[PDB]
Amino acid sequence: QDLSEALKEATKEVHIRAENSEFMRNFQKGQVSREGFKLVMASLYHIYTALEEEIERNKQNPVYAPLYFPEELHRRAALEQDMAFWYGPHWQEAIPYTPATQHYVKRLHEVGGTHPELLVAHAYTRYLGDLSGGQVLKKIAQKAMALPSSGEGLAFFTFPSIDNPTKFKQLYRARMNTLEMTPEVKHRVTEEAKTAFLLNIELFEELQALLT
Ligand code: HEM
Ligand SMILES: [Xe]
What we know:
- With about 210 residues, the chain is mainly α.
- The chain has one domain: Heme oxygenase-like (Heme Oxygenase, Chain A), CATH 1.20.910.10.
- Helix content is about 70%, strand content about 0%.
- The protein contains ten helices and no strands.
- The longest helix has 29 residues, at about 185-210.
- It is globular, with a radius of gyration of 17 Å.
- Belongs to the heme oxygenase family.
- It comes from Rattus norvegicus.
């Protein structure tokens, strides 16, 4: 079984639970205000920063290298732009760093520093999601909060270096299947992906609690 197939199958159930979490539900209903949106985007800033720091650390490692696409996928730069938009010039010392976000970042550094062979699970969970649900969320965000088609405030959801997301995802899945795979690694990579989804679910549950 190809890694891409194993991952889709391993996370199809938890994905249903994630996309139907209370926070995503309210978001899809346009009931989230500037406050909630700023909270989640700030959390993603911390998460992608940690993820990409670990990707850079392991870019030359064959257990990840084939998936090294900073120009097309990395979000830190976009998030820095979005943070400046929503939080202003001094966003640096203004954005929050919630416990659930810290927990996610912690696991990211553990994976990147001690179990790099599992980093693909985290890149897969974040980036493939961004190229999917993230695109529908972008349109919902624009409508609900009156964000211009121009893109300001939604740089995170914009991939200027990717012409066709559907096509890129197919290329990304194919490349995922070229990584050195053993029953051992495939087993743990799919487990870490489920873990990644859970960390996301926990972040959302925490943010929803903080907002209500
Ligand atoms: C706002 C709720 C969400 C919506 C509307 C949504 C919707 C979708 C859609 C339409 C697909 C299928 C795309 C395709 O087959 O090419 C997809 C795939 C995916 N989503 Fe989501 N999603 C949501 C939340 C999430 C979350 C919270 C994550 C984890 C950060 C996530 C991660 C993924 C991944 C990793 C895939 C690719 C699965 C695969 O092909 O192996 N999604 N999503
Ligand atoms: Xe989001």
